[PDB]
């Protein structure tokens, strides 16, 4: 449903965020990994790096563009998440995709801004 909806617009990020901000059901079936909560805690990592305050997800499954089979917006054609693991704050696990669309990792520090840098 929400996956079909982001196909009807030129701003899929805004479409998804407006949709969940208006009460729509967040995308489900994100691939939540089981992990030792002993990682560094950076946003995006080759291996799971969740701290005790985070959960780790398979990157493709929390990428709106991957899930909806639409063009990735990066300058190249490369998902930042796909093939990697994405750490999500534990308080935000109800909508991992929305959290990734609403946040950006530190350019120097690689942690989430407002959760690292």
């Amino acid at each position: 449903s929400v996956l079909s909806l982001v196909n009807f617009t030129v701003d899929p990020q805004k479409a998804y965020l407006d949709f969940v901000n208006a009460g729509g059901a967040p995308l489900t079936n994100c691939v939540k990994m089981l992990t030792p909560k002993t990682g560094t805690g950076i946003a995006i990592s080759v291996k799971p790096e969740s701290t005790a305050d985070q959960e780790t997800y398979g990157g493709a499954s929390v990428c709106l563009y991957c899930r909806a089979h639409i063009e990735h917006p990066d300058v190249s054609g490369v998902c930042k998440y796909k093939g990697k693991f994405v750490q999500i704050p534990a308080q935000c696990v109800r909508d991992p995709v929305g959290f990734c669309l609403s946040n950006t990792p530190c350019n120097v520090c690689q942690y989430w801004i407002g959760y690292g840098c």
Binding site: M33, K47, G58
Partner: protein, 281 residues
């Protein structure tokens, strides 16, 4: 103890039986937003951590039946968590999905052309549709083992009571060691993973395939298995050991006692050192 292990492996006690094939009668699982196949794959990986897998750089792994009806591939993400960072994962399914594989190929596994030999094959393929040996994707998998698998390479291929193949059981005789592994996470299912560890390309054990499926079912019917995921409580050593296994090119004429011994201990692969080309036809 057994419920802290990742699962159960068929013992030679049942491998050497001679019985008719009977119906599988099992008497007998919750997850913490975590898909069940997370636990099933992690326990398969945990068991493979105790086997002598070859683990080279640029390790070549192909994962068949990786997709789910949800359009995701939890097993592939588990393989990404488990394998070396420089491992190459190719995955495949009849149905569309998205995954953390390096290369993802849609359609029948028979459309997957492996140009070079691989080091590890994982198959979770299963067709939704008198229990006789099945053909289906097993014909493709058996040919893959005979042609597209490195000496020293390994396979883990899902079977069930009714999804199984005489030919695949017999091919296990061409590995240094083999078993059927049943995860504790899916212990109330007739599912098991036929494991061939360290491919030798030569018959080490003569196996009657139809008799051995009867032995596998006899084992399942004889062996209490409790659903459990206790083995996933401590994941501190989950990742596959970075063995740095060497890859060598040798002619058949050169494969001597020393080489067979190294292949059998997980200490060597024999295959091309090229760059991998795996594409749809």
């Amino acid at each position: 103890s057994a419920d802290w292990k990742p699962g159960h492996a068929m013992p030679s006690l049942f491998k050497v039986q001679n019985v008719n094939l009977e119906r599988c009668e099992l008497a007998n699982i919750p997850m913490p937003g975590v898909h069940m196949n997370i636990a099933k794959y992690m326990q398969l990986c945990q068991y493979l951590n105790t086997c002598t897998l070859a683990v080279p750089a640029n390790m070549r792994v192909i994962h068949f039946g990786a997709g789910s009806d949800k359009g995701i591939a939890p097993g592939t993400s588990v393989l990404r968590q488990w394998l070396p960072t420089d491992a190459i994962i190719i995955d495949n399914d009849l149905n569309e999905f998205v995954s953390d594989a390096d290369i993802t190929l849609f359609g029948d596994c028979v459309t997957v052309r492996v140009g070079q030999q691989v080091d590890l094959v994982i198959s979770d393929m299963y067709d939704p549709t008198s229990n006789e040996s099945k053909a289906l994707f097993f014909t493709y998998l058996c040919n893959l083992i005979n042609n597209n698998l490195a000496l020293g390479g390994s396979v883990a291929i899902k079977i069930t009571e009714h999804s199984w193949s005489v030919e695949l059981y017999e091919l296990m005789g061409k590995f240094a060691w083999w078993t059927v592994f049943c995860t504790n996470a899916n212990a109330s299912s007739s599912e098991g993973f036929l494991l061939g560890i360290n491919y030798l390309g030569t018959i080490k054990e003569n196996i009657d395939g139809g008799a051995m499926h009867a032995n596998y079912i006899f084992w399942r019917n004889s062996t209490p298995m409790n659903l459990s995921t206790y083995s996933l409580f401590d994941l501190s050593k989950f990742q596959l050991k970075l063995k740095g296994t060497p890859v060598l090119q040798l002619k058949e004429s050169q494969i001597n006692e020393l080489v067979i011994s190294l292949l059998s201990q997980g200490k060597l692969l024999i295959r091309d050192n090229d760059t991998l080309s795996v594409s749809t036809d």
